[PDB]
Amino acid sequence: DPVRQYLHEIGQVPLLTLEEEIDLARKVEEGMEAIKKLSEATGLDQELIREVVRAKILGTARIQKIPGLKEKPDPKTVEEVDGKLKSLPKELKRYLHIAREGEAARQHLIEANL
Amino acid sequence: LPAGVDALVKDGEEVVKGQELAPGVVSRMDGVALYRFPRRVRVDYLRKERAALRIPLSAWVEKEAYRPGEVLAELSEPYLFRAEESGVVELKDLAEGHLIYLRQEEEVVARYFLPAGMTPLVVEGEIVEVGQPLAEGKGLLRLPRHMTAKEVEAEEEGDSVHLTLFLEWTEPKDYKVAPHMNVIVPEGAKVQAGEKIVAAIDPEEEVIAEAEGVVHLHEPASILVV
Numbered sequence: 001d002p003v004r005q006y007l008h009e010i011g012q013v014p015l016l017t018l019e020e021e022i023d024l025a026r027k028v029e030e031g032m033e034a035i036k037k038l039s040e041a042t043g044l045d046q047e048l049i050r051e052v053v054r055a056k057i058l059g060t061a062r063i064q065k066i067p068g069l070k071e072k073p074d075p076k077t078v079e080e081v082d083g084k085l086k087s088l089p090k091e092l093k094r095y096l097h098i099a100r101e102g103e104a105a106r107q108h109l110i111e112a113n114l
Numbered sequence: 115l116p117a118g119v120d121a122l123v124k125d126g127e128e129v130v131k132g133q134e135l136a137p138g139v140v141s142r143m144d145g146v147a148l149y150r151f152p153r154r155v156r157v158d159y160l161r162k163e164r165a166a167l168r169i170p171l172s173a174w175v176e177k178e179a180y181r182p183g184e185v186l187a188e189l190s191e192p193y194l195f196r197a198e199e200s201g202v203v204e205l206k207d208l209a210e211g212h213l214i215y216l217r218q219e220e221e222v223v224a225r226y227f228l229p230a231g232m233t234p235l236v237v238e239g240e241i242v243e244v245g246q247p248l249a250e251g252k253g254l255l256r257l258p259r260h261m262t263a264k265e266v267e268a269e270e271e272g273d274s275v276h277l278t279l280f281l282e283w284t285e286p287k288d289y290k291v292a293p294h295m296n297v298i299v300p301e302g303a304k305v306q307a308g309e310k311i312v313a314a315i316d317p318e319e320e321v322i323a324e325a326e327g328v329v330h331l332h333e334p335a336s337i338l339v340v
Contacts, residue, residue, distance in 0.1 A: 017293075018293050019151050019293040019335065020151075022293060022294060022315075023151075023296060026296065
């Protein structure tokens with residue numbers, strides 16, 4: 001039974017107290033604004049850096065190769081923007097990390113509310 | 115953790131299986147314990163004051179820098195500490211000891227130090243005059259428990275001696291967190307004045323350091339050992 005399977009799977013991840021909720025939301029918004037600030041940093045779009053960070057987060061090679069056979073090349077347009085964002089001073093860097101953490105928080109929030 | 119109960123172990127500290135993280139909480143694994151959603155923050159403010167003192171030389175324990183609790187003189191007979199200036203006194207209680215600020219009008223005339231075992235004969239706001247005694251050293255007079263002393267100065271005439279002290283003490287204050295708030299600085303944080311400690315939903319509840327000092331974290335909502 002698939003229903004049993006999924007229901008148990010979401011039964012694994014616990015709920016979220018008001019503290020956790022507010023904190024996660026905060027971290028998410030901080031992440032987004034960090035992406036915008038990075039858009040003012042290297043001069044690239046929000047969803048660009050966003051999807052790059054995701055590609056570094058919710059899976060290594062699996063986000064690229066199968067949303068259909070053709071999207072944005074793995075060694076080429078992913079890694080070069082990665083390395084381009086790698087080559088920045090300290091503040092933009094800490095904002096990169098912050099952005100990533102924001103993404104993760106988004107994921108968890110999504111789960112409880114699943 | 116049950117609400118209100120602090121953690122006996124600090125943040126970012128290694129813990130071994132069987133060790134208590136709290137009165138009712140025991141660790142099931144070796145690893146690094148981590149605070150999760152602290153319910154309180156403790157800010158220790160650094161208060162520094164350059165002051166003056168007068169003690170008979172027969173008593174004096176001669177020292178360049180006095181540590182907290184360290185013995186200051188012996189004080190043979192109970193000794194009236196006689197004001198070397200004239201002004202309105204400001205009596206400030208620091209734990210065991212006292213501080214007396216001699217103030218004319220606005221600006222202060224003098225700053226007097228009262229170690230533990232030297233008892234004040236005056237009252238805050240009261241008026242005193244030159245030679246009018248202030249404190250009474252009764253025996254002893256070892257330096258305060260929470261306060262250190264550096265850069266001593268020695269002025270000797272006959273029996274009496276006059277010393278200016280650079281004094282360093284810790285004035286603790288406890289700050290209450292809220293679910294609408296989040297702690298920025300780490301545990302055992304090195305922090306300056308006017309710096310944001312705990313951010314919040316509104317700038318109102320934002321905790322801002324009144325002075326350069328040290329930051330401690332207490333009362334976690336839960337402790338995650340990893």
